[PDB]
Paper text:
To reveal the molecular basis of the described transport properties of SLC26A6, we have determined its structure by cryo-electron microscopy (cryo-EM). A dataset of the protein purified in the detergent glycol-diosgenin (GDN) at 3.3 Å was of high quality and allowed for the unambiguous interpretation of the cryo-EM density by an atomic model. The structure defines an inward-facing conformation of the protein that generally resembles known structures of SLC26A9. In the homodimeric protein, subunit interactions are predominantly formed by the domain-swapped cytoplasmic parts including an extended N-terminal region and the C-terminal STAS domain, whereas the few contacts between the transmembrane transport units are confined to the end of the terminal membrane-spanning helix α14. The substrate binding site located in the center of the core domain is accessible from the cytoplasm via a spacious aqueous cavity, whereas the extracellular exit is sealed by extended contacts between core and gate domains. The presumable location of a bound chloride ion is resolved in the structure of SLC26A6 at a low contour of the map. The anion binding site is placed between the opposed short helices α3 and α10, which partly span the membrane and whose N-termini are aligned to face each other in the center of the core domain. In SLC26A9, Cl- binds in a deep pocket with low field strength, whereas the same pocket is shallower in SLC26A6, where a conserved arginine (Arg 404) increases the positive electrostatic potential and thus likely stabilizes the bound anion. In addition to its structural role, Arg 404 likely also contributes to the stabilization of bound anions by coulombic interactions, with its guanidium group potentially engaging in direct interactions with bicarbonate or oxalate. In the density, the N-terminal part of the IVS folds into an α-helix encompassing amino acids 569–593 (CαIVS) whereas the following 61 residues are unstructured and thus not resolved in the density.
Numbering used by the authors:
A (entry chain B), B (entry chain A): 28 to 49, 62 to 594, 655 to 747
The structure:
């Protein structure tokens, strides 16, 4: 029920009744600890409870990373061996600075395709010169990837130190989903070349995808039969193994190493059949064994990469955060965004120093790590060690691995991103603005490539956020019978408007973008054309003044001038959605007050929160003409005051 | 007073008590009339009342436009004669499609400097070749200016037809003020070359202003004494005349033609002293007499100009609208933004066809037109006719006009834009966000030039709008004694929080940018670390389940598990500032509900407006778990329900 009986309360009354009023060691060890979680979570590691699970999880993660690293290195354009380096250099670094215990840092399809586009831009493939140009191009691509990794790591470390871990919140879920779907489309188009076996020119810039698809279609009859057969067999095997594992996941504690088995079988078949020599099927080539000494980044490329560097960084960070947060909700721990950004930046920087390319976290790999029984980053560290073994001696065993098979892996690794079209269609029933953002991001990333596409998508998202506040549901409120609740009359038929009092509510805040829109909507839906009546009144007053001046040389009420008096004697604004009052909002409010006082209508402001009143006071909004007694706290209070003060 | 007694009302009750519920001839003539205001305002023109005033106003406007056109043509890099063409071609066109009576369309400093930058970019000044290269460069600059005018006119007409007259509202007042101040600085730096007489290379791209200033300082000792003396004398005369006119404006019905008198005196003195031959003072040159036949735009430049075309268009439109609206408030008529955009676009297009450069409206010229007694666009048309006379025969009289004098005019014509630094300093007391936008726009336009500077300023303004919603005044509300008004406790000391009930209000809307921020702020200021308590509860429940499973193999309340029970039994959200509910907002609300129901706290939503409920219903927010009875209409109603339903 309700029994609230009180005297009428304005802003001044409300203030009267509410009494308005306005290092060294310890930190040296807190900052060090928060920068290095390892010192806090490794000493308290339960060996008996988690060792075996972490060992099995790391074994599975390494098993899955061995073919994924090579495939994504091939996607990036680099020789496959460097991919393994990723699976070994950032990961261990993430073991030291990482806060998420259930994500595996490594090669991601989107990051790999972004690095591949960069390498193609700064090192196009040329068919004129074959062997020595190929070696020089591989070296140049490796240097470009290392410099890009160094720059991305520096950007991420800098953003993390300034605690700019909230930059991900600008990337809404529809935008990220569209970007990932377009990245999957890009990856499929790029891998079509390796699946068919065609030789194609390196396209770059806008509309690269369309040109690549057209060239693939044009050169399709030249596709090698053996390469297509091998790619189809590899894809069929991968699909069958993945479906089998999904359909009896409960029986087997760990997923079947389908990708590793496919890679081993392809290598064995190619060795036993001489595919490269006989059927001219492309192979990965020679994989060096050992650790490459660190190489300093080439600063001369900093101008070329920076525009495509920061973007990549952000994208990776975004994905990383998402995974961590998801696993956070699955294990009841907090993942610090800033520390995650710092860890990823340090991993990328150390990789770039040690001949690597930018890395991120993989969803399928993280899910496998969780399922196998992982509970800490130690598992991931174990994975790195296994990759180290592959780097040390088991690297030349994959000399005769068919190349297309790797491409096939990536094609079978884009299931979720292409599944997101289901989400795309589902957005047609929940929010069409999200669907518009999704389609704009998808089209921009397809046409203007990923680097510009993300910028265009972010700018369009911000513009649509601004536009959404420029299209609010203006409501001429009315009183629900025998209540104090005021709701839209056009929506609630039973609601009846108060006689002589109008209440106008805007669902969105009134700032510089929609201040004029708010004023025009108020004047349009107020029932009286305020501008026309004010102009008439001014003209009539000027004519009367001229007549008086002429009479003197020879020798204000609306009813007096014959103008139609508005039905409502008072107007009440419901600025409950108002957040901040800037200069334009204050100007609009003053203009509304002056215009309605000229038409002999007193304006009352109702439901203003704490910051609005303070900002109005600071902006010199209040004066003798506009006192604080008009700034009522509740709409019904203002309606009661207006009914108690009707002008004669 | 208050006497509102009613049963408790939820969303379902409120719906029950409010009954929630969801060409040819004439047109064609209406469209023709609204596109051509002339057919409506010329036939009803009062000859006796307004003819003489319009004639005098047009005479004054032409008097002021004669030197201003030449000065701004010199600023744009074109030969001065083409400037006069502007004062004759767009203006008359604006007489046909114009809706504002009290603004004069012509050459503006910002538009002129933007055209000059474009011409310098597409036709750099070369000192190696002197005469024939000068003629070819002048022809190329004229073609570039004509093509730019055509493209700007097409852009403006297209925007007006789609009724995109609200694109100006993105340009806030601080942004426009900073852009104009930086344009004035640009103009002063550019005119320093003509004032001193130095020969300088054509700088372009970012940091052009700094390089130009450094080169001027480096070559300062080579400045000609005669040119500096003439410029100083012209500036002193202009300042004296302007101050005299301002200080006795009431006595003289029309302003003293200071600029025209200065131009005539400079021409006479140069003729009578042989400044060009003896003192080597620069002169304007030869002014052709007659009308240039129309020249089709060169489409091959469309790629180069488009990036700098649209920008210019918008800027001009912005200024135009402002002036019109101001004069609207001074004469009680409505100026249609779309029709103004169409008129300006048609004027620019016809000028570009007829060898002209983009035009806008001038504030000082419009003020002089208003003061002299103008009441219609006919006055402006009269101005064009006078300029026509100057184009016909009185064009070769200005052969020996000193060039620096024209530059001096522009320097004395930047008084308001440089005065805006007073506004800049005044922004330090009203709104520091506006000051930040002003400084960012000023610096960006100074360094990265006007074309990129405007884009950077707009992007930063949108980003700061988004950020402003990410920093809201989260408030833990409390009840003002013996009232129903709930206000911030940290701000109002007397306000007391309800025992067992918490109210949380965010001043800004909850959307994808600040949804996580809103949830984290709620959990932080709710007095209980929700995440830690939920994680403990989950761990304790899992341990108990494991113990039960072990017991079975061998053979929910917070108080039961020993966890600390929160002081508040219910939580009430005050989403009065919520405008639209997208997918991320719905996910955040569902997560808040689930998390607080796990901690045994029931969440109630209060003060939701019309669109919020509809969007929640459309998004499948409501289900069996979350009924519509929790969506209370008033905060006090929800508090009463929570107090009437405390769990045992
Ligand atoms: Cl993946
Ligand atoms: Cl001006």
């Amino acid at each position: 029920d309700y029994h609230m009986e009180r005297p009428l309360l304005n802003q001044e009354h409300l203030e009267e009744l509410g009494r308005w009023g306005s290092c060294s060691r310890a930190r040296a060890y807190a900052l060090l600890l928060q920068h290095l979680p390892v010192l806090v979570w490794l000493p308290r590691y339960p060996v008996r409870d988690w060792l075996l699970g972490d060992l099995l999880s790391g074994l599975s993660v390494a098993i899955m990373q061995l073919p994924q690293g090579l495939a994504y290195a091939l996607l990036a354009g680099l020789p496959p061996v460097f991919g393994l380096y990723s699976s070994f250099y950032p990961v261990f670094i993430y073991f030291l600075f990482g806060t998420s215990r259930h994500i595996s840092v490594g090669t991601f399809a989107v990051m790999s395709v972004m690095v591949g586009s960069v390498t193609e831009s700064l090192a196009p493939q040329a068919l004129n010169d074959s062997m020595i140009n190929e070696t020089a191009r591989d070296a140049a691509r490796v240097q470009v990837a290392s410099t890009l990794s160094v720059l991305v790591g520096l950007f991420q470390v800098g953003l993390g130190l300034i605690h700019f871990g909230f930059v991900v919140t600008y990337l809404s879920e529809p935008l990220v989903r569209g970007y990932t779907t377009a990245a999957a489309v890009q990856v499929f188009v790029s891998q079509l070349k390796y699946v068919f076996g065609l030789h194609l020119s390196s396209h770059s810039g806008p509309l690269s995808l369309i040109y690549t698809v057209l060239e693939v279609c044009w050169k399709l009859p030249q596709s090698k039969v053996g390469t297509v057969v091998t790619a189809a067999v590899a894809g069929v095997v991968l699909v069958v193994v993945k479906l089998l594992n999904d359909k009896l996941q409960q029986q087997l504690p760990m997923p079947i190493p389908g990708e590793l088995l496919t890679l081993i079988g392809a290598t064995g078949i190619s060795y036993g059949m001489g595919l490269k020599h006989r059927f001219e099927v492309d192979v990965v080539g020679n994989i060096p064994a050992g650790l490459v000494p660190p190489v300093a980044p080439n600063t001369q490329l900093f101008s070329k990469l920076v525009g495509s560097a920061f973007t990549i960084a952000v994208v990776g960070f975004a994905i990383a955060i998402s995974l961590g947060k998801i696993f956070a909700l699955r294990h009841g721990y907090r993942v610090d965004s800033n520390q995650e950004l710092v860890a990823l930046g340090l991993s990328n920087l150390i990789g770039g120093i040690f001949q690597c390319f930018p890395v991120s976290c993989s969803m399928s790999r993280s899910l496998v790590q969780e399922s196998t029984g992982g509970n800490s980053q130690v598992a991931g560290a174990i994975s790195s060690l296994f990759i180290l073994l592959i780097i040390v001696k088991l690297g030349e065993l994959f000399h005769d691995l068919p190349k297309a098979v790797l491409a096939a892996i990536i094609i079978v690794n884009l299931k979720g991103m292409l599944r997101q079209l289901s989400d795309m269609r589902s957005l047609w029933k929940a929010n069409r603005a999200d669907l518009l953002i999704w389609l704009v991001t998808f089209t921009a990333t397809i046409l203007l490539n990923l680097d510009l596409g993300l910028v265009v998508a972010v700018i369009f998202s911000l513009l649509l956020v601004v536009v959404r506040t420029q299209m609010p549901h203006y409501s001429v409120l009315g009183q629900v019978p025998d209540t104090d609740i005021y709701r839209d009359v056009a929506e609630y038929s039973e609601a009846k408007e108060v006689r002589g009092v109008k209440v106008f509510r805007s669902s969105a805040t009134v700032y510089f973008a929609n201040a004029e829109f708010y004023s025009d909507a108020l004047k349009q839906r107020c029932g009286v054309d305020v501008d026309f009546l004010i102009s008439q009144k001014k003209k009539l007053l000027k004519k009367q003044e001229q007549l008086k001046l002429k009479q003197l040389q020879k020798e204000s009420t609306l009813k007096a001038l014959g103008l139609p008096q508005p039905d409502f004697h008072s107007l009440i604004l419901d600025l409950g959605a108002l957040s901040f009052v800037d200069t334009v909002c204050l100007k609009s409010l003053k203009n509304i007050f002056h215009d309605f006082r000229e038409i002999e209508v007193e304006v009352y402001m109702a439901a203003c929160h704490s910051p609005v009143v303070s900002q109005l006071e600071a902006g010199h909004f209040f004066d003798a003409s506009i006192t604080k007694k008009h700034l009522f706290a509740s709409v019904h209070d203002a309606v009661t005051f207006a009914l108690q003060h009707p002008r004669p």
